[PDB]
Design a protein around this ligand. Sequence first.
Ligand SMILES: Nc1ncnc2c1ncn2[C@@H]1O[C@H](COP(=O)(O)OP(=O)(O)OP(=O)(O)O)[C@@H](O)[C@H]1O
Ligand SMILES: [Co+2]
Length: 299
Amino acid sequence: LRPKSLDEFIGQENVKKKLSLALEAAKMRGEVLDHVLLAGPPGLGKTTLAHIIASELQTNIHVTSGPVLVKQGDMAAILTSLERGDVLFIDEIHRLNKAVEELLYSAIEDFQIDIIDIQPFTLVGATTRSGLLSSPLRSRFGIILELDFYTVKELKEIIKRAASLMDVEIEDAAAEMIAKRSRGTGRIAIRLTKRVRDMLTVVKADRINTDIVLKTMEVLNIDDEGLDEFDRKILKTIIEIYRGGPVGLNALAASLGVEADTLSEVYEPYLLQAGFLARTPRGRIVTEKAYKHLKYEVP
Ligand SMILES: Nc1ncnc2c1ncn2[C@@H]1O[C@H](COP(=O)(O)OP(=O)(O)OP(=O)(O)O)[C@@H](O)[C@H]1O
Ligand SMILES: [Co+2]
């Protein structure tokens, strides 16, 4: 269900125009595209854009991630398999250990490594937050693209596109409802569309309407604000256990039984954006909107 070209990519206007300028120019001159850093919460299309970059350049893409490359030998094998103009896609690039990291940095300064010459290539890194990378490495990317949450309108377009490919009809009103509950994320909108499609199948309807969407949301436990089970657990934990905050990230993560990253990089971004949560020097706090939405008496 992923697009194959920038022209097929819906949303992320700021990112597309910047990337398109560099991409088209590099192609016209037959030059190797400058290194690109994609940053933003999960499900926004960073991986999708990385593949588009290689396809537009008509080169090969090599997918990997920091957590995987633990020993220099692993990084070496990849770099040496790169053909001129190829794209080296490193997801979770900020998770590269000193060893492999130093090796990669070296290959991008003169395309050559020692425990071996490397073919000119384009490093495309992806991270949940650009600030997570070390000062040195980040200074190597000539193109930094910060993805933002999609607007309801863009999500609706994505939802309509997804439905079309799944051989299912959907009413604008229904598409709008799903978009409003997609937490600004394209991946979520598409997955909710697949689930709503299942409801259409079971109820034997001719097209997706608001009724069908509502029924699906009830089954998936997604509220009118698009919040899921865990989103509500985060807010309720702060409200009940920490009296609304402030509560530190490490303390909140331990109470929830999840890694700190899952909160700050995966769930918190939308909660902050939508005004359910706020960050202070002393820690996270819930807003009046969170109390109201979850029906907790405003203290
Ligand atoms: N025409 C399109 N069809 C499908 N998805 C599209 C389209 N145009 C843009 N997108 C975006 O591409 C993403 C596709 O979802 P997917 O789960 O593949 O994301 P991703 O690239 O893995 O995310 P990330 O790497 O940022 O975590 C969505 O964020 C979606 O909005
Ligand atoms: Co802290």
